[PDB]
Design a protein around this ligand. Structure first.
Ligand SMILES: C[C@H](CS)C(=O)N[C@H](Cc1coc2ccccc12)B(O)O
Ligand SMILES: [Zn+2]
Ligand SMILES: [Zn+2]
Length: 231
């Protein structure tokens, strides 16, 4: 069973093995009196690990590194943040201090700077146009176009057919739009269509928040986004 927000105290991180050499990491944060879960990804890269996204804050990300060391015991050598919000870059400074090379698109780095958030060190080239993909270690990085944010990336693990949608993809239990202050609602369905066209064989789809599923999560997200558009 996938861990639930009720099963994780803030400050703690859980790892969930999705496939051989692929885990998600699950952490929580409190906001306006409620508690929210957040997902990232860990992908084995030979004798090293690639991290996708922080665990939403410095304290959570330190706990993430400690949990990885305890449960997996391979070094996190690189980390990619998939958009500029704090559940993706919050903790970049902890990663950097630990010797992890941190990466994001130049779009994400710019938006993080404007927002006053932590800024990944390295800039990922080749992701500037909708439909662009690049290989990064054991994963493919894909820019589907603007959606949840103008910079959002998705991540595919070809060995395991795992699609990590980040916060551009909603879990099935989310029936109404979440944080859309930085979204391109008009482009979001089209961007989702690009994901479906590029990764039709995906067997596991991980949203930025909540429970994984299959490719149904893409149409689900389009339905919620379009309903919000028409509010
Ligand atoms: C942090 C994350 C970036 S995508 C996010 O905004 N999550 C939404 C809840 C939320 C809105 O504004 C916040 C501010 C702080 C914490 C949580 C939130 B949601 O899942 O409904
Ligand atoms: Zn976000
Ligand atoms: Zn998010």
């Amino acid at each position: 069973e996938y861990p639930t927000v009720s099963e994780i105290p803030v400050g703690e991180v859980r790892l969930y093995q999705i496939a051989d050499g692929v885990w998600s990491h699950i952490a929580t944060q409190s906001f306006d009196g409620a508690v929210y879960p957040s997902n990232g990804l860990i992908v084995r890269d030979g004798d090293e690990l690639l991290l996708i996204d922080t665990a939403w804050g410095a304290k959570n990300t330190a706990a993430l590194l400690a949990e990885i060391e305890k449960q997996i015991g391979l070094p996190v050598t690189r980390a990619v943040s998939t958009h500029f919000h704090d559940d993706r870059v919050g903790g970049v400074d902890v990663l950097r201090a630990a010797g992890v090379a941190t990466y994001a698109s130049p779009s994400t780095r710019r938006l993080a700077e404007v927002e006053g958030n932590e800024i990944p060190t390295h800039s990922l080239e080749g992701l500037s146009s909708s439909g662009d993909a690049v290989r990064f270690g054991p994963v493919e990085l894909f820019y589907p176009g603007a959606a949840h944010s103008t910079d959002n990336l998705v991540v595919y693990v070809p060995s395991a057919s795992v699609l990590y949608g980040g916060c551009a993809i909603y879990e099935l239990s989310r029936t109404s739009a979440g944080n859309v202050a930085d979204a391109d609602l008009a482009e979001w369905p089209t961007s989702i269509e690009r994901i479906q066209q590029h990764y039709p064989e995906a067997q596991f789809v991980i949203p930025g928040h909540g429970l994984p599923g299959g490719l149904d999560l893409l149409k689900h997200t389009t339905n919620v986004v379009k309903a919000h558009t028409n509010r």
